[PDB]
Amino acid sequence: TTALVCDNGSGLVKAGFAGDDAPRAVFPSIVGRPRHQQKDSYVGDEAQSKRGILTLKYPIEHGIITNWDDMEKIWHHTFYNELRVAPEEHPTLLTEAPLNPKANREKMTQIMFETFNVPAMYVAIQAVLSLYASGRTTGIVLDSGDGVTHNVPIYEGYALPHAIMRLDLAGRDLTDYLMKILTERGYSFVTTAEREIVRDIKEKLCYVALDFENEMATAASSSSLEKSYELPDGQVITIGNERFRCPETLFQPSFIGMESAGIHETTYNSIMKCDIDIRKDLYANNVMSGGTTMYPGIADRMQKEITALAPSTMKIKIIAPPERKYSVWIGGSILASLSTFQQMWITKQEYDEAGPSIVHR
Amino acid sequence: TEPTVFHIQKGRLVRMSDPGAFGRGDCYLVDAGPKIYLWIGPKSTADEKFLTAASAVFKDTERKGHADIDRIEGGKEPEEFKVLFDDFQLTDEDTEGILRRVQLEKREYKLWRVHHEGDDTFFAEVPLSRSSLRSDDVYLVDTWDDIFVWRGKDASAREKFDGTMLARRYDAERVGVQEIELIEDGSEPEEFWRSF
Ligand SMILES: Nc1ncnc2c1ncn2[C@@H]1O[C@H](COP(=O)(O)OP(=O)(O)OP(=O)(O)O)[C@@H](O)[C@H]1O
Ligand SMILES: [Ca+2]
């Protein structure tokens, strides 16, 4: 029988079958309940479309599962509605954020065995899956998703927790900022389809400037940086410096009023928290993963910023795999396919004997 | 040719009887004692890269972390690495990987109803059947590679707008171009009916 792979993110669930090269189910990690006036909950696209009558909640906050009642609804939807499988017939691989608390991993394990009756399970660290999928045991992962951005240094297969940095700024903040600056141009984005337009513009037209101030000057002096997005009805929205002001927020969090270092400085700070003897390997192996690393120009900008900060004789290299939008899921798909990993799966009988703490051993 | 070489092949480590040739489409794990080398072919796939890295950590851990792991990019071998072998050779060998493109049978397509009447708006899955196509609403047929948006003869302009935007977001979340076909009630092409 075939393993299932579920990469639960703050904004999106990515799920599918081990051995597939892409997740076949991708849907919003949102649970809607019609509170205070027999189906009692909605998930995903259906839920987000009915915001006017549902109370919507995100069960995963900054990568960490926080609302377990709603997370169970997400997993039930994943198994039965999206994948249309019987969970008791499939070993299931789940992913977890950096610095996930032990009690959190234990509750994930309890729910998989006691609620869904999976025959076996495994929990993998998201950043390690991405690093291995790039063919590396050592490097520093920049994982930027919808709710959180982490820098995760990894040495010969093991994450270095004291040097992990967390920045509570990622794709949802960029969507909200683009919506703000487009509303300042006199547009209105209130309906579900209008909010999808902002998301589509962000993912299709935005880019990271190599030099922000020079790019602003170019945008002020000519229309060569303008690009247009055509709506289904033939309307056209044209943007110029909004294209690169939006993701500039990753490097300048003050654009949205956040008093935090940008992603180049958090990367440098993370490397500086590691022992000097491994920093050379981290500088040469900055691996990007996650949907918010997909902006054209981001690798070249990171290369420039890190080079400005790094010591003499260090080699700076940013790795941006073309598949990095879903590199966590793809890493899990590979893992759950590999013969030599089968011995490391937790079986239901082991859970019955040992309880949830078996997930650490 | 002193180190032990494992050729990653279809999700397994295969110990090479006579190492030295390295194919650009593949990955290899080279156990040279105090040093473990990952040899990453420039045309290799993620499943091959992953097994090499994971296996190197396992072998190092087996020796309580006492080996240095080095990553080699195929075609750019250092002098240290080439001299380990009697006759180091770079070839075009490429073993096919284990990952497969997503494919849907017809019993797996999904059908989505799009409704928008004032502030009465929603998406909703409905049973994949020609019966579900109501002429006053819009419907999305998801066949993975192709998305058909069927616009009822009596559907509102807002529902047609919403259906196309939803189809755009499906395409955006799936790697590679998915074709979006806008279909009009009463002039459906044969390609559309096959999905039922
Ligand atoms: N091509 C693109 N350009 C810019 N942003 C993109 C692109 N594709 C997806 N995104 C953004 O990536 C985010 C989703 O990424 P991902 O699936 O990695 O996050 P997640 O796992 O749900 O969240 P997190 O990792 O923060 O818990 C969304 O904000 C989405 O708009
Ligand atoms: Ca994620």
Ligand SMILES: [Ca+2]
């Ligand atoms: Ca020989």
Ligand SMILES: [Ca+2]
């Ligand atoms: Ca190969």
Ligand SMILES: [Ca+2]
């Ligand atoms: Ca070691």
Ligand SMILES: [Ca+2]
């Ligand atoms: Ca209607």
Ligand SMILES: [Ca+2]
């Ligand atoms: Ca098809």
Ligand SMILES: [Ca+2]
């Ligand atoms: Ca696509």
